[model samples]
Target chain A: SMIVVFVGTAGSGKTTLTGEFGRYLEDNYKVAYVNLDTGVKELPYEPSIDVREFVTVEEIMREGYGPNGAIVESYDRLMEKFNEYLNKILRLEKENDYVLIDTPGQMETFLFHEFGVRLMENLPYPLVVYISDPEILKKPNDYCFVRFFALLIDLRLGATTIPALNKVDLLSEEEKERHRKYFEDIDYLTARLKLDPSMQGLMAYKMCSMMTEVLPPVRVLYLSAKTREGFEDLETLAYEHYC
Target chain B: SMIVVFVGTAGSGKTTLTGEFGRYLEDNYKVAYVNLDTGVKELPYEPSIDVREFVTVEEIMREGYGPNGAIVESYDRLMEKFNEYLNKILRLEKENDYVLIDTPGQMETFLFHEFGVRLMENLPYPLVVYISDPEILKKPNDYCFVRFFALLIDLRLGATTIPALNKVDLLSEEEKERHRKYFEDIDYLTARLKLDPSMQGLMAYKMCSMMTEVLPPVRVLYLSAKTREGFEDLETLAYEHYC
Candidate 1:
């Protein structure tokens, strides 16, 4: 079974996408869900292997930490039972066609933390899908920041990451056009970045160029887990890359 | 009076730099310290205008939130008195030669939150100094990521940012040489990135190029708040750019 990990900032729709994508796969494939977020109160999909079952944020908070500290601590505690959980996940992998791993909303810890480093080492070349909510990306640099972040995640994890613009349905036609143009044409994005002749504008232009140059050949998939607009593209991507 | 805002990830020496830099400024200038972090337990410097006086993470957590949520909420609550605090800061500006603002360890909220947007609007052209701990930057991509993040902060905040490599005293001579070489020669860094023929390596190479191109003409300052090694360079930058 292919291991697909969904990661993004909070409210970028990792949980929703995991549930929706699982529903999409269930039509033809046996899908096993794994929730690695011990802090989340609930999940949209029932996890086949849940980290909360092993360690939880509440338990960590009781030991004395704020939510942010607790979440990272929970990951550390979960690390103690890492092999046990991996075996459980692998066991499910044997019976399923796809094992979808949903990560915590706080991505910094998972991406840069030691737990993430070990998790990547144990997972068999998982395909990471980085989702960004377009609602917050009002400017060209905002889009560039998200792309740069996704690329860095790939570099840090040494994993194949697919950057996707999620919550596209929430955007207006004009907003959607801007995102599309920014994703499709390197010059257009750079030109928009150049609009600010300030130091930041120049930096954004260079950042965008670097992003364009280093960006995976695979086009960024635009999808709405809410409306399921681009599930087919995701499926096609999975088949072409992993299957 | 120059407004110098020091920002970085946790344990990157933002507060220490603020205190040390303030001490340096005090030798010749009247410096006022402002603590913008409500969650911090204690500060290295005496903040003339403290955010804890306005709101606190512990108080917010009492309203039922984990530490992360509470810190962000504290920002919101502090936002309610933003103008009041701004007045106090501006009043200090009238009396002081410099105002050093120390931010929270959790930079995401301060950089991306609405409170940050409003804070930037009220401040009169503040110089944002982005400090990164070299101890954590074990790889080329790690350094590139810090540079990129600093650039994005400049864009999002519309401030002139000086990306500085802090804690240089901690690095071994070889490590310092590598960082110096990477900072001096873009080709060397990209060559290191290309050591990996993987997608991430190629992506990192492009990212590094973009960073090199868009990086501020002002060289990245190498300083140690502990030993005060690069304080003169920082003073020189402030004089050249804003003095």
Candidate 2:
């Protein structure tokens, strides 16, 4: 089964973009959106597979555990509950479609934790999409450190990761130009960081430059979910890659 | 002996804001900027006290440890190094009007970890100004959750926290109106989250509302550091609080 995973920090427009992308997928192709953020009480879409069905995050927190502890416990419980449903759903459903997984805002919840790894292990590798906001890349050292760390974790998990940067519309014209400058000199950044040349950091940076260099790059797309802008390009990527 | 700590997520303009605020302090008041981000190779302002002087984060990483591991190690080393410099700096230098401590951008680095607590504990409870891009608070959930979590952590540490929503110039007038709806609903949010009703959360919310209720609310300030917008209000707050 194909699964798309959205991962990022809080306020990075993860949920907003997920809703828009989900609508695009539903309209364009046969797909089911799955809600893995058990802690989230409300969302724009109903999930075909919802973690809240098995265990509520509030229930976990009521046990006197911290937010992180409760989230991790809920995630584990979700995997156990979904494993059976996943088998049944995959068998009953049509092939060549997709399952979109909307995760929690915390990157550590899915990126560094075994919870996401377990779910990715069950899905087809190349179909997983890693979504992030482009604004995060502006703070080179700080953002690069977090992005590199999460990217490394995704690679170690053996998931075919598609990195998509969201929220270009939020940036001002000047800020967008700054973003372009950052991308143009990304190779210098990768080398300065002393990161492995073969890693996702270098590759993503190169892809970003190429995307900006050509009139219209093949992979990357700038989107604003609030305005439903660039939904077509986002949809095209998801379907072409996964379906 | 007065200490002001900077806190925010990566790419949320913590570093840029810190540098600008530090310059403001340096120009107007007797202040010393302290760099606590050990991973930071270069800083805009020279710090009176630096954690990197004790141990470079690159060295820590060279020992085959990841960023989180290196951060923790560097933080601990920072504590020790700070202790060593505390007596010398406190005695030799003037009891400066303010000592602005530039922390790592990772929210957890300051919020959950003992690194921030230990550093703040060492000095007077000077104003803790939290810098966040206005874009980051676009969603109602983000504003509520971030404030909730931040209040919880500040309460735990017994630190007086002030929130500043920066980069208001980036948002369109319409977008700003949409974001203001959530900011205006702080009281309703406090009840929904079931945060401390009487003591902390409610008080924080009340103070925030009162600050913002005037012609211009006091709680959140719209700032564009690049354009020198709202720097006066920030300087006034720092002056009144620390001076």
- Best candidate, lDDT-wise? 1
Candidate 1 lDDT tens digits, B191-216:
89888776566767766665436643
**Highest-scoring model, TM-score:** 1
Model 1 residue runs over 4 Å out of place are A53-55, A63-95, A172-174, A184-187, A206-219, B76-91, B169-178, B209-212, B215-219
lDDT of 2 by residue, B157-229 (tens): 4455566677677878897776666666555654433454422233234333332322233355556657767
Restricting to chain A, the TM-score for each candidate equals: 0.93, 0.74
Scoring model 1 with DockQ, what do you get? 0.38
* TM-scores for every predicted model: 0.84, 0.46
After aligning candidate 2 to the native by TM-score, how far in Å is the CA of A108 from where it should be?
A: 6.9
Report per-candidate DockQ: 0.38, 0.02
lDDT of 2 by residue, A1-243 (tens): 456666655555677777777776776566677776766656787677766777865577567643434555776676665567556446524543666667765554664345665555555553445555563353344334333333333433445444555777777888776655544455555454445353223423432233222223223345677667677765666556654
